[PDB]
Amino acid sequence: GSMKNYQPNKDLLEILESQKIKIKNLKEEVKILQRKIDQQIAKERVIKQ
């Protein structure tokens, strides 16, 4: 089907973030703007007790 969103799995994410750590930088720059876009839906995407 398609990719679904689930709880904030850090164990599985860390696996991808490990190598992405390099790109994380380039993203951290523009992130300054996306910071507002995240609150649009990204804020809901990540569920927290």
From TrEMBL:
Coiled coil location: 9-43
This protein's record includes keyword Coiled coil: yes
Key words of the record: Coiled coil
The keyword Coiled coil is assigned to this record: yes
Name the record gives this protein: Uncharacterized protein
Protein's organism: Apilactobacillus kunkeei
